């Protein structure tokens, strides 16, 4: 309960080895710095990172967004349908495979 959530945001140009331009998801564009210890090379334009919501400093570069819409668009049951259940499409099955 003592913990506080961090602000997510995509990152942009690395102005220096310490000053970076993050872009909070549906939010403003800031210039911010990595905390102290995180890598700087992997901090490339297009890496989801968490922001401390007091100084907006970069911490905990997250892998990437799954966007639960996409999670539903993957973890959906397609059925047990096999090729031996489709009939009369043999040439078309050959093409698709």
């Amino acid at each position: 309960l003592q913990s506080v959530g961090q602000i997510v945001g995509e990152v942009l140009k690395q102005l220096t080895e310490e000053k970076f331009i993050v872009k909070a998801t549906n939010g403003p564009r800031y210039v911010v710095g990595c905390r102290r210890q995180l890598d700087k090379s992997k901090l490339k334009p297009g890496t989801r990172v968490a922001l401390d919501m007091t100084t907006l400093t970069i911490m905990r570069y997250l892998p990437r967004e799954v966007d639960p819409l996409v999670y539903n668009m993957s973890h959906e049951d397609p059925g047990n349908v096999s090729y031996s259940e489709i009939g009369g499409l043999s040439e078309q099955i050959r093409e698709l495979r």
Partner: protein, 70 residues
């Protein structure tokens, strides 16, 4: 004392700073800028900023609280 004062001036434009877009300057010490929050503001220019860089669409960085163009 001048070293102290100049150190404070430098300390003003330290991170975090909110990025925005430069609109046309008003006077030597102030200009209008539209922050990337969407809102527009009439903001004092930091006298250290070189004026030639102020193109009418340049990306600039403002103080997070006072929106000061720094």
């Amino acid at each position: 004392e001048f070293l102290h004062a100049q150190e404070e001036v430098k300390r003003i434009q330290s991170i975090p700073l909110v990025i925005g877009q430069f609109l046309e300057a008003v006077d030597q010490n102030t200009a209008i800028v539209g922050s990337t929050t969407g809102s527009n503001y009439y903001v004092r220019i930091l006298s250290t900023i070189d004026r030639e860089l102020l193109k009418p669409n340049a990306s600039v960085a403002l103080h997070k609280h006072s929106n000061a163009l720094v």
